[PDB]
Amino acid sequence: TNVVTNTPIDVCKGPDVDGTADKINDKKIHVSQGLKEFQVAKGDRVENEITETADEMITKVSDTKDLNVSTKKPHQIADVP
Amino acid sequence: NYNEKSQRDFRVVTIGYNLAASRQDEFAERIYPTTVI
Amino acid sequence: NPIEGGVVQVLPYIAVMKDVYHEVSGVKMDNEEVNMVEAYRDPSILDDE
Amino acid sequence: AHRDSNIEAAFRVISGNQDETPMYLFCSDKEIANYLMTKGDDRTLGAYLK
Amino acid sequence: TDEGPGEVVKALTVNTNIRNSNNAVKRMLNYLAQLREVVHNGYNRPKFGIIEGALSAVMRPTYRYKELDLEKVIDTIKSKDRWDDVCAAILNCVKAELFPAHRDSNIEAAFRVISGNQDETPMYLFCSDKEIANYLMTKGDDRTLGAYLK
Numbered sequence: 001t002n003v004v005t006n007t008p009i010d011v012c013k014g015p016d017v018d019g020t021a022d023k024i025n026d027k028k029i030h031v032s033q034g035l036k037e038f039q040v041a042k043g044d045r046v047e048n049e050i051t052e053t054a055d056e057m058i059t060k061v062s063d064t065k066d067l068n069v070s071t072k073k074p075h076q077i078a079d080v081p
Numbered sequence: 082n083y084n085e086k087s088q089r090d091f092r093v094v095t096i097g098y099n100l101a102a103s104r105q106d107e108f109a110e111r112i113y114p115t116t117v118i
Numbered sequence: 119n120p121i122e123g124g125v126v127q128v129l130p131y132i133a134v135m136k137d138v139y140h141e142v143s144g145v146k147m148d149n150e151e152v153n154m155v156e157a158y159r160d161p162s163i164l165d166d167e
Numbered sequence: 168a169h170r171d172s173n174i175e176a177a178f179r180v181i182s183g184n185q186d187e188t189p190m191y192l193f194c195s196d197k198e199i200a201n202y203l204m205t206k207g208d209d210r211t212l213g214a215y216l217k
Numbered sequence: 218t219d220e221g222p223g224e225v226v227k228a229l230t231v232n233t234n235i236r237n238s239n240n241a242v243k244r245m246l247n248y249l250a251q252l253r254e255v256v257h258n259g260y261n262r263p264k265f266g267i268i269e270g271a272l273s274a275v276m277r278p279t280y281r282y283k284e285l286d287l288e289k290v291i292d293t294i295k296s297k298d299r300w301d302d303v304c305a306a307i308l309n310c311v312k313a314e315l316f317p318a319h320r321d322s323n324i325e326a327a328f329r330v331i332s333g334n335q336d337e338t339p340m341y342l343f344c345s346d347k348e349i350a351n352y353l354m355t356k357g358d359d360r361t362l363g364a365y366l367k
Contacts, residue, residue: 010120038082039089039121048093050128057130060183061227062101063234067158067179069107069186071215074354080301087123096129099183100154100227102234109241111342132228154228158176161239164232170347213351 131155134163169216190217245344249280256280263323275331276323281314304356307349312362315341319366340367 035041050057104115134157136150152163169175179187191212193203210217248269255268256278265274285307293302319325328337341362343353360367 037085039085039087042090048090048126050093054130055222055225057095057098057128058132058222058224059097060099060101061132061224061231062099063227063230064103065101065185066103066106066234067101067176067185068238070350070354071186071188074214074357075209075211076358077300077355080298087121090122091124091126092119092122093126093128096127097181097183098130098132099180100132100231101185102231102238104234104237105241106238108344109238112245112344113241132225134232154231155173155176155180157232157235158180159173161235161242164236164239175347214354216351 188215188217252278252280253282272327272331276327277321279318279322281318283310283314285310300352301356304352307352308356311343315366316363338365338367 103110105113132154133151134154136148138147138149140147150163157164174189178189179185193200195203252268257280260267260278263274263276263278267273268278287303287306290310291302291306293299324339328339329335343350345353
């Protein structure tokens with residue numbers, strides 16, 4: 001027996017293809033192709049690639065606090081006898 | 082194109098960038114305390 | 119997500135650039151572009167006299 | 168190595184927390200790990216590193 | 218353009234603020250070099266015009282330079298004690314030079330006559346980099362050197 005922990009599995013159903021030949025009405029037929037299956041675009045050409053400017057991805061530039069603060073509480077070590 | 086795999090669109094993560102500096106840091110401030118002139 | 123199949127990491131920063139002109143015969147741009155972050159360990163990159 | 172590199176600043180500039188230091192992982196095999204796992208909850212290096 | 222960067226403009230101050238701290242370090246190290254020259258030259262009594270510092274006319278100029286090559290300084294027997302032996306060797310070297318330099322100088326006389334406090338003890342700062350401080354801070358709970366120095 002096996003146990004799998006914390007792993008999501010996608011179990012493919014497999015096909016519903018059958019081995020039946022269905023006649024179709026093809027008197028008139030219409031075919032269209034949308035640019036969806038290609039993931040070429042899903043609304044706009046670059047939804048992923050940087051949409052903001054470099055300047056707008058700068059989050060904070062403070063002039064108050066300083067990023068050099070040694071931990072206010074220094075861990076102390078007791079003597080070893 | 083029998084097979085299709087994602088290459089055009091990826092998850093995009095922006096790395097934070099946060100600068101800060103005081104008039105002096107603690108090292109310089111303790112040695113050279115700031116006096117306003 | 120299976121639809122994504124990968125990740126892109128975007129790294130913004132502010133660079134401290136030496137004020138240099140473009141050499142008419144230059145192969146590259148002789149302009150020391152360094153991240154401001156480097157100034158925390160080596161502030162000398164900011165020196166100007 | 169913590170001094171020579173600027174990782175301390177790198178984490179603070181990326182995370183935005185002026186009180187931030189990296190935590191180090193001792194990645195070891197089973198033999199070595201038994202020699203490292205002798206300290207209590209005080210998994211401290213120096214004054215502030217964990 | 219009309220719209221300036223919201224945050225990048227503030228980098229002008231951050232640049233200056235970092236340079237402020239760096240200038241403090243340069244001035245400290247440059248002053249110490251100048252101090253070495255003046256004390257080495259044989260200037261021991263107070264005088265006006267020998268060194269920067271308005272109190273150099275008050276107290277005896279004093280300077281000690283010691284090179285701690287720890288292999289030749291530490292006494293250690295076994296690794297269990299190595300941390301305390303490294304920390305103690307460095308701190309004891311400071312004590313060894315600090316006590317006679319604190320005696321030879323007039324710091325206590327200058328501080329007591331200038332501040333007006335009949336008995337005010339100066340505090341000494343251990344100015345170091347991260348590597349050295351990581352050793353001294355772990356044993357800095359006592360904060361006291363000898364009898365009454367903080």
